[PDB]
RNA sequence: GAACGGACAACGGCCGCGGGAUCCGGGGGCGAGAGGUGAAAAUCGGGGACCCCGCGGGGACGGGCGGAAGCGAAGGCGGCGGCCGGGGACGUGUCCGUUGAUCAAGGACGAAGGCCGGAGGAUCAAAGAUGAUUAGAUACCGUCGUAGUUCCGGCAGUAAACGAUGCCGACGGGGCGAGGCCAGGGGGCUGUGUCCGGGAGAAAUUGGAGUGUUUGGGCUCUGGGGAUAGUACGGUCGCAAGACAGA
């Protein structure tokens, strides 16, 4: 258990899923691969398939760059927008540990407000 | 209900059925009257006189031990106040609110309660002017 | 014998300068010409002498204040500290 | 708020209603020079050099209490004496209050 | 059940004004301090502190309803 | 006619309840009228829990919970099926299962 | 307006002149020094002036005599102190943040 | 593109079991002053279960550490803050219970200005609400227990008190005469001013 | 009506402290996208975006707790501490003794939007501008953006300002609740919901919408088939928008 730790910031919004790996500080980023790097359609960036492939390439570059273990900070968009981690949240975490990154201390770190500013959409809402 | 609210509270003291002369009080009827006149010139109001008669000397009503009310005692000895206690309590409440609005003029809640205590003040003054307790040209000090 | 119903002190300006300009200067001409309470003697005898200088005519207490009021909001805040 | 208090806003009118007092600064130094005054309340609005002479003469004469009122001449007229504003009150005797 | 004759059970339950005759829940009493020989007298639902004058201790303090009695005090109701 | 005895919201002895924004529609619904479903589930889904046992540094690692208060306006709450279609006599049910 | 300030020592009488501060009055004791109290009317160096207090007649260079916020109603808000490098950032009446 | 980066370990004061929690990295520099430019502002947060690897029920806090000094591939890193984990700060609040929060600005024995945020929940003595006068009563009790415990101490013992949660248990003992509290935790500690 | 007592209180005004989020500036890392959508485009990206970490600035806002829970006359009120002020309920051998109820006129308050002067401007966003959708699309969707949203002084005086239910008062079934005070004897007052009955009702329903042809408690207001029309004229108010009133 001589492994070196990094932080896996996994943003999973409704449109994309960033798999970002940095050091324990967070200031120096080892590898970040988003889901839109892995599919050519704009609608499939937030997919669990693209989140898997983004986690596969992120875990591969993290192991070759001397990051064996990882800490996960799951994230949604947060703030005034949706605090729920998106569709490719779990698939980015599943493919990450299934490719040789031994995880520890996974956390939900979304920007929750103590009563935010005004949200987009208007009073009547996003009428669809 | 209340005059200026919607509460229908009923918390009121109930007088006993029979006026009982207090055997536990040791002091004479003239000793009670002299104490009441002393407490009035000491500065206490007639409600505070009957409270301190009840709590400290255990004279539950002075009507029990004297047969006169506290205002009847003060009117007998000429110590009846110029403005009655009911009106002077509204006047000090009005003046206390009005001094707060001198430095806190945005308090629209207090100007609401100012017009409410003044309406009770003018209602009470109209009654006191009617029964000759108060002069007909009486005005609250502005 | 009020004389005017709405304009009051800016009835001196007549019909000139526009209603909104007369309405705007009314609050200031009430302010710059009024007597104020002296905070050194207690009397309502503070009158403006020139823009920025307010003097009590009873006890000669003169102080530097606002243009058309003895106190401004910025001037009050620095003194309340 | 409770309707009545026992502070200086209560005791000082009670001393003037029941007691001997004098209003004014000339009367204040006539009594301090005669040793007749037992209690002095001045407004904060009172002139400081006239206020300092009262505090000096009171510290001469049996440590008479001088109390600076939290207010002005016009707020000392907010008690029993109300024809005019009050700079300073010399209390000769307080008949019912606990001022002294 | 008769309305003109209310049983003593139901009268203490109902409100004091809503009884057939308005009956007080309050009384007067005597407070007995132990260091002290005199017996200071006070109201049941008192609104003032009562202290024995010599050997000064506080006997009862006012509360919302009945005044709560402080310390070691023997109390005796006063009714007659 | 009057469809619900509470008129849909839980407001009694108030004049005003502050609006909140829908988590799905961003509509302005009052906090009283809004359908609120507090979901507390694990961060890692239950399918992947065997895969996190092989990968934890820690013996006896407890997977953390995810806490979120879904607040839905009335239009999207029937569309997200957070509120179920009930009968007229079934409307007066209040207990959750 | 202007404030004529008369300073009396043992040696001489100095007659100083300052732009009048709102709240100046005739007979006011003013203190002009480095670390005097921060009452209204005093003049002192900005390091001893707490942050967020509106000052006026601010010097632009040290011992200049006061340049900024000199006309009517103007004040300068002391925003912060760089206690290393001895620099105060201030907010001018134009909204300009000035070191 | 990555071999120019060299690793640095991180070093805490001795308060915890682990002296070196992890490794940061940075590109190779010619000077030591440019290395201080890149490193000495950095900061990291470590869970208390990583700082005391045996205990797992004390894995609810995470301690924030800013580096202050580098001496030869070792980053000295002092205390920068404590915060409850998001799984914990959302777990301690239940419905049908009065949540009581308080904060206090306070300096230690050393000149470390801290802001200590504490929370508590009223427990079953059906809806276990407290009167807001009682909430004010425990909050005054919360202000005094923060100020006696951290201003009487220096910071190196205060971060020991945050680790053992003495600051939480002292609220549950003191406020128990008024309110049956539960989950009395210090939610967050920030450093806002340092002595230098 | 007044007093007093211990309580209770998102009641108000002000002062101070604080919270994180959105946005922006700036630094460091990374290296190709990001954004956004039903799908895309517009847009920003090797001049390094997005994302990650720190710092800074600024305005706005109090999440979770937070509920058929509290308060206020209504509008409304939710971080914390303090000041000033207010409030109802309860408790009481405290005072006064009919001082009361309801209202033309009159006065005060009154969400949002709006208006005036001043300050400020982060988000959002009428108007406007675009990118799409569409048969068309002046809209719904995306992006941007001014007024505005914010504060201070005033105007305005309207809302589905709703409980679509005037105020005061007497009487009237049980059950369950999570209010406050009191008492200590599945208790009393006073709020507050709920459920089942009674009665009522055209019915939905309803503790008043009950005690109404077995019709009478007081007081105020309103309605009189639909449309014309809350329109016109006259009036009053308002800077205006318009409001009140009203065929
Ligand atoms: Mg009335
Ligand atoms: Mg009554
Ligand atoms: Mg409403
Ligand atoms: Mg950059
Ligand atoms: Mg408005
Ligand atoms: Mg507006
Ligand atoms: Mg404007
Ligand atoms: Mg926009
Ligand atoms: Mg017309
Ligand atoms: Zn004067
Ligand atoms: Zn004794
Ligand atoms: Zn919705």
Q: How would you describe what is shown here?
A:
This is part of a larger assembly, with 8 protein chains of 8 kinds. By secondary structure, chain A is of the alpha/beta class. Chain A is 20% helix and 24% strand. In chain A, strands 1, 2, 3, 4, 5 and 6 form a 6-stranded mixed β-sheet that branches. In chain E, the strands form 2 sheets. Chain E has a 3-stranded antiparallel β-sheet, with no helix packed on it. Chain E has a 3-stranded antiparallel β-sheet with strand order 3-4-5, with no helix packed on it. By secondary structure, chain G is mostly beta strands. Chain G has strands at 2-8, 13-19, 54-55, 76-82, 87-91, 97-98. Chains in contact: A-F, A-H, B-D, B-E, C-D, C-G, F-H. Chain A binds chain F through residues 1, 3, 69, 74, 80, 82-85, 90, 93-94, 97-98, 101-104, 106-108, 119-127, and chain F through 21-23, 25-28, 43-45, 48, 51-52, 54-58, 61, 63-64, 66, 68, 73, 75. One zinc ion is lined by residues 38, 40-41, 43, 45, 56, 58-59, 61 of chain C. Chain B binds one RNA strand of 247 nucleotides through α2, α5 and α6.
Q: Give the overall silhouette of chain C.
A: globular
**What Rg of chain C is obtained from the alpha carbons, in whole angstroms?**
15 Å
Helix-and-strand structural type of chain C: alpha+beta
Task: Bin the strand percentage of chain D.
Answer: 15-25%
Largest sheet of chain D: 4 strands, mixed
How many helices of chain C? The count is 2
How many individual helices of chain D? 4
What topology does this entry show?
The structure is cut from a larger assembly and holds eight protein chains of eight kinds.
Chain A: E1 5-12, E2 17-22, E3 29-34, H1 48-64, E4 69-75, H2 89-97, E5 102-103, E6 107-108
Parallel strand pairs in A: 1-4, 4-5, 4-6
Antiparallel strand pairs in A: 1-2, 2-3
Chain D: H1 8-17, E1 19-23, H2 25-34, E2 39-43, H3 48-60, E3 66-69, H4 73-76, E4 88-94
Parallel strand pairs in D: 2-3
Antiparallel strand pairs in D: 1-4, 2-4
Helix pairs in contact in D: 2-3
Chain G: E1 2-8, E2 13-19, E3 54-55, E4 76-82, E5 87-91, E6 97-98
The structure holds one RNA strand of 247 nucleotides.
PDB class: ribosome
Keywords: Microsporidia, Pathogen, Ribosome, Hibernation, Genome Compaction
Entry title: Structure of the Paranosema locustae ribosome in complex with Lso2
